[PDB]
Design a protein around this ligand. Structure first.
Ligand SMILES: COc1cc(Nc2cc(Oc3cc(C)c(C)nc3-c3ccccn3)ccn2)cc(OC)c1OC
Length: 303
């Protein structure tokens, strides 16, 4: 019989994502994470399975994928994905619970950037890894490991690019992700989806917002900000595309950068990265690799 789902015991409900539902389970004397889909959610199950099985995808800052499988209880079939389990949960949860040191901030930011750089980067060869854009990067889709570093998850909306033929593997729809984190060009539909760089640039804008969430929680001399989502001060809790568009495209506002961040070199560098992720024109934004290089340079200097 099968070696995966058949041999796993579910222990704890984690919650519902975009599709399916997450659980903590036990496999071969080890805790694992399981995402369970119904039969009518096969398209979303297969697609996430497909992205995670991409050659050369594994990276310390991407969720470690174990397997896709199904399980029959005798009445209905469940479609399963199985991965590493991370006890701390999402970066959103982590930042609500805790403040971080300067070192902690740099580890969380650098690990996020490194994960995104890996997704984004095409690797040549027989084991040819295409460039991959996430399309729904947010603090709730980044997990925090026990070592205080991040890994990116929720790859079901991702798109993959073949540079030789300049083709994307699926036909992309507009505005598929979380409205709050959508780039200006996504919000106003001006994004050119026949230009794969556009998807990478939209991811970068979203990472900038995530960086802002982290920096708020960096505590120096006991001084820090409360946890907030980006645009907490300007839109409703579950904002529409029009509400986001009015703030981000028309009024041209971005999350507020405190002046107390000027007083610290680490926060000064992070603040600069955010601004350079937040330009309305995606072509002006930093790349994930450049951000990784900068934070790696900063990480060396700090400790
Ligand atoms: C204890 O509270 C939380 C724990 C975790 N841990 C966790 C969750 C995971 O979920 C996934 C599992 C699988 C197999 C796949 C394909 N994806 C995910 C996933 C994770 C995040 C976003 C989207 N998909 C994987 C590893 N560790 C997570 C929590 O929230 C996300 C917790 O708080 C509810």
């Amino acid at each position: 019989g099968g070696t995966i789902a058949r041999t796993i015991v579910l222990q704890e409900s984690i919650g519902k994502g975009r599709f399916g539902e997450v659980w903590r389970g036990k496999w071969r004397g080890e805790e694992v994470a399981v995402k369970i889909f119904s039969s009518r959610e096969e398209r979303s199950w297969f697609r996430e399975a497909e992205i995670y099985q991409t050659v050369m995808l594994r990276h310390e800052n991407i969720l470690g994928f174990i397997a896709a499988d199904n399980k029959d209880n005798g009445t209905w079939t469940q479609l399963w994905l199985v991965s590493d389990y991370h006890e701390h949960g999402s970066l959103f949860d982590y930042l609500n619970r805790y403040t971080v040191t300067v070192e902690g901030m740099i580890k969380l930011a650098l690990s996020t950037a490194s994960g995104l750089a890996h997704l984004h980067m095409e690797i040549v060869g027989t084991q040819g890894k295409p460039a991959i854009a996430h399309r729904d990067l947010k603090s709730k889709n980044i997990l925090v490991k026990k070592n205080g570093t991040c890994c990116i998850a929720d790859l079901g909306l991702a798109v993959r690019h073949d540079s030789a033929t300049d083709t994307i593997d699926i036909a992309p729809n507009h505005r598929v992700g979380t409205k709050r984190y959508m780039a200006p060009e996504v919000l106003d539909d001006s994004i050119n989806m026949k230009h794969f760089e556009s998807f990478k640039r939209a991811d970068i804008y979203a990472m900038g917002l995530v960086f802002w969430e982290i920096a708020r929680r960096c505590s120096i001399g006991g001084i820090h900000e409360d946890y907030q989502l980006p645009y907490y001060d300007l839109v409703p809790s579950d904002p529409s595309v029009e509400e986001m568009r009015k703030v981000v495209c028309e009024q041209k506002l971005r999350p507020n950068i405190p002046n107390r961040w000027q007083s610290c070199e680490a926060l000064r560098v992070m603040a600069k990265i955010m601004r350079e992720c937040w330009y309305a024109n995606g072509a002006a934004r930093l790349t994930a690799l450049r951000i990784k290089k900068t934070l790696s340079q900063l990480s060396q200097q700090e400790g």
